[PDB]
Amino acid sequence: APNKPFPQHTTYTSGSIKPNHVTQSAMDNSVKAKWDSWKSAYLKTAGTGKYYVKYQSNGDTVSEAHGYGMLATVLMAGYDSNAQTYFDGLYQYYKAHPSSNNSKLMAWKQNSSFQNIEGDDSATDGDMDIAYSLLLADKQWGSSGSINYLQAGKDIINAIMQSDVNQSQWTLRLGDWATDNTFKNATRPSDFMLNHLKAFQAATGDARWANVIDKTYTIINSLYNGYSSSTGLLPDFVVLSGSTYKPASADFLEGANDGSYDYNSCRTPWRITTDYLMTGDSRALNQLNQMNSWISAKVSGNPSNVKDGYKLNGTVTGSGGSGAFYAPFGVSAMTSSVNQNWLNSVWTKTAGSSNEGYYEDSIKLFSMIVMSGNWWTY
């Protein structure tokens, strides 16, 4: 039986808050309902012994989606009696899709027949969530069964350090391909999963992870003060120019909003706050607090007014509402009791929302796990 069955009712750092206009059991049951709806839409078989996550309508996948499936299945054990079967199947799918640069990392994208497409290099975020999910699996089920989760997790973590970390700068690369002069020093703030990195250090003893945590907090604060002092917002991509990290310019890698708060960075208020929640580490607290203050004022406290993109100065770039964007602000709102009403509003919006699509629904689900007090770490 699972050692950390959902719901764990984790105690987060002192002074943090959870929604308080609904009961704890209503929250737990909302998460349960969202998990059932997520799996019904997104969690699919992938040939015998394998599962995968369908990230788009045509049945393609990416390693980001894979790692969200792995993470969710382990967190939802205790509720979902098939959690370990799903997790194991997802594991076997990951093992069958090694990156062409480091065989412990994952080839980032497959078509609907599970063949690698668009290049078979890794993506650092998918790698990191797969790695973290394996440490959680060791906690959840133990490593004595048919898969030694802890060892699998160490092996991928060491690979991330080997191939997905720039060890000159102690920054996370975009992936194991990102080694040339244009891309080697670039980093994606949505990969700043500081609390995953602490877990990596704990599992391996490698203090290089501490170097990356330290540098990454320095970058967050440099960009905050330098580029987003009134909003707290971080750009989709960051580049090193001369002495200083800066937002990327348009069409650096994905599109026109590469130096703005867009579809990558919408995850940062979730990923960064989680370290604070779990540890009390206050090194991004001013940045997160500024975000809370700015967004809740920007939208007059109504989560339906959050748009799917902003410039770093707070100018709207998005054209619509999106749970990928409102739900992570719910998590950052948890830093202070001054946001109680705003956090309650985000909760209600998120829990009451319809299925929007793989990306939005995954982000809402994790945000709900966190807001309900059910996140936990290695």
Side-chain angles (χ1 to χ4, degrees):
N3 301 324
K4 300 257 210 223
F6 184 86
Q8 279 291 288
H9 298 333
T10 304
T11 309
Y12 300 149
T13 204
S14 304
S16 65
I17 55 163
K18 291 159 42 160
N20 76 350
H21 67 318
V22 293
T23 69
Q24 184 70 53
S25 65
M27 299 193 277
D28 295 340
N29 288 343
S30 297
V31 177
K32 286 174 177 181
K34 292 303 192 174
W35 169 245
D36 298 330
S37 169
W38 193 92
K39 66 177 184 167
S40 173
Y42 314 117
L43 181 66
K44 305 296 199 200
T45 59
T48 309
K50 285 171 198 177
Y51 287 93
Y52 94 115
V53 182
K54 71 171 313 200
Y55 108 114
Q56 268 173 353
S57 289
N58 79 341
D60 291 356
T61 198
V62 294
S63 66
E64 170 203 269
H66 202 69
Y68 297 163
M70 292 184 63
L71 228 188
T73 58
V74 62
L75 292 167
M76 298 311 309
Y79 177 50
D80 189 325
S81 69
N82 293 312
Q84 193 174 14
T85 301
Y86 299 145
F87 185 85
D88 292 350
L90 290 164
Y91 173 83
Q92 299 296 339
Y93 184 96
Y94 143 73
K95 285 254 47 137
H97 294 85
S99 163
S100 53
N101 303 132
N102 186 313
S103 63
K104 296 299 174 65
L105 304 179
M106 193 168 171
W108 81 287
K109 188 173 186 182
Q110 292 81 51
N111 62 22
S112 61
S113 301
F114 321 122
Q115 307 173 287
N116 294 338
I117 63 172
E118 308 224 59
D120 51 9
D121 311 84
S122 74
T124 297
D125 60 334
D127 295 338
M128 293 175 61
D129 272 334
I130 294 168
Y132 184 67
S133 78
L134 288 155
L135 299 180
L136 273 25
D138 170 69
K139 290 290 148 161
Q140 188 66 102
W141 298 299
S143 287
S144 282
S146 57
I147 305 159
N148 185 337
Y149 301 122
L150 186 55
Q151 185 67 53
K154 286 181 195 177
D155 286 346
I156 183 175
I157 292 162
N158 286 326
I160 297 171
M161 180 53 66
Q162 285 170 15
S163 297
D164 286 339
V165 171
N166 178 329
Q167 302 187 207
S168 289
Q169 290 300 147
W170 306 113
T171 54
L172 280 334
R173 308 183 189 280
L174 304 178
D176 62 14
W177 58 271
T179 57
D180 75 10
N181 280 4
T182 303
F183 288 107
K184 69 191 167 163
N185 296 323
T187 194
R188 180 167 41 233
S190 60
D191 300 358
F192 292 177
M193 311 182 209
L194 296 144
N195 204 63
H196 280 46
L197 306 181
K198 287 175 183 181
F200 295 175
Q201 192 178 7
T204 60
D206 188 354
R208 290 182 273 247
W209 294 112
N211 293 168
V212 176
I213 294 160
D214 294 347
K215 179 64 177 288
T216 297
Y217 276 121
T218 302
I219 291 172
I220 290 162
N221 286 104
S222 178
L223 285 164
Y224 162 42
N225 289 294
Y227 293 91
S228 69
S229 70
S230 70
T231 72
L233 303 174
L234 295 168
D236 268 28
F237 296 96
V238 169
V239 304
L240 179 60
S241 146
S243 170
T244 264
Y245 289 86
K246 302 181 187 292
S249 62
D251 296 328
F252 171 77
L253 191 62
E254 289 178 8
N257 297 140
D258 289 354
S260 292
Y261 187 84
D262 207 87
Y263 272 76
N264 292 277
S265 278
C266 63
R267 287 165 300 187
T268 56
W270 157 39
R271 295 304 202 171
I272 302 173
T273 305
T274 289
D275 194 36
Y276 178 64
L277 291 177
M278 301 304 293
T279 67
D281 192 327
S282 65
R283 278 180 286 180
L285 189 58
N286 296 163
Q287 178 257 159
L288 292 174
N289 282 331
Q290 190 74 57
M291 279 196 290
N292 295 333
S293 186
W294 171 77
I295 189 70
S296 54
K298 184 60 174 195
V299 299
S300 306
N302 179 355
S304 293
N305 295 156
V306 169
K307 301 261 189 300
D308 62 343
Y310 298 91
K311 295 193 166 157
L312 309 181
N313 67 10
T315 300
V316 170
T317 63
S319 69
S322 171
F325 287 65
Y326 62 72
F329 289 128
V331 177
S332 58
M334 297 172 78
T335 61
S336 176
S337 57
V338 309
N339 309 132
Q340 186 69 68
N341 198 59
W342 166 235
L343 166 55
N344 289 354
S345 295
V346 180
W347 170 273
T348 283
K349 177 84 189 168
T350 304
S353 59
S354 292
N355 278 182
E356 288 168 71
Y358 146 77
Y359 191 53
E360 302 80 4
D361 293 345
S362 305
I363 293 172
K364 285 187 292 181
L365 169 65
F366 294 117
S367 299
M368 283 172 71
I369 289 165
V370 177
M371 284 183 278
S372 69
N374 293 128
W375 185 268
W376 55 271
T377 185
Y378 178 72

